[PDB]
Amino acid sequence: NFELPKKHMQLNDFVKRVQESGIVKDAVIIHRLFDALTFGHEKQIDPETFRDFYTCWKETEAEAQEVSLPALLMEHLDKNECVYKLSSSVKTNRGVGKIAMTQKRLFLLTEGRPGYVEIATFRNIEEVKNSTVAFLLLRIPTLKIKTVAKKEVFEANLKSECDLWHLMVKEMWAGKQLADDHKDPQYVQQALTNVLLMDAVVGTLQSPSAIHAASKLAYFDNMKK
Hints:
Elements lengths: L10 H11 L5 H11 L9 H19 L5 H5 L7 E10 L2 E8 L2 E6 L5 E6 L3 E11 L2 E10 L6 E3 L5 H21 L3 H20 L4 H5 L4 H6 L1
Antiparallel strand pairs: 1-2, 2-3, 3-4, 5-6, 6-7
Helix pairs in contact: 1-2, 2-6, 3-6, 5-6
Subunit structure: Forms oligomers. Interacts with 6 of the 7 known isoforms of 14-3-3 proteins.
Subcellular location: Cytoplasm
Protein name: DENN domain-containing protein 3
């Protein structure tokens, strides 16, 4: 069936090849993906960029599929709730573990019992801050998430991945705020598609402007802006 494109792609070609790949079908979102991948450059996608985007998406999907969840967590997931993005093991103010993002919420998967912390639901987020702690030559990137009516801020040392997680969390938060305001779950599904595309864009572009380019897909967060 589908084979990776071998010719340069204008926008309309790109839309068709992404649809054929099965990664996403919504042409409007793929248009934003095109804008993200060509940000700053000429408006065309070459085979190498397409191949890198596809590989990054599939790698993130495979990492997420291989997640090890404690049964206690799995018993309290909603129906059809799944991990779509898994971080590396990181230091946090709740212990060392991997951050797992579902459609609904963020978990930390930890050593021991019960083996997880629910960090926050996208509904209950109050503020998300992307910071870096400095001391002499040391720089510690720190993602901060505050939940409504809860004093303790969650802090994660996500290293070079911190900017991406900051963007993905803000977009999933904004998507849920809008889904709740419109009583339309489709916003959550669109936000999830948006953030997984952002992840693949960042992995593809390999640049300091990559988070700015990837924000072309942060449809719901950009609205709040």
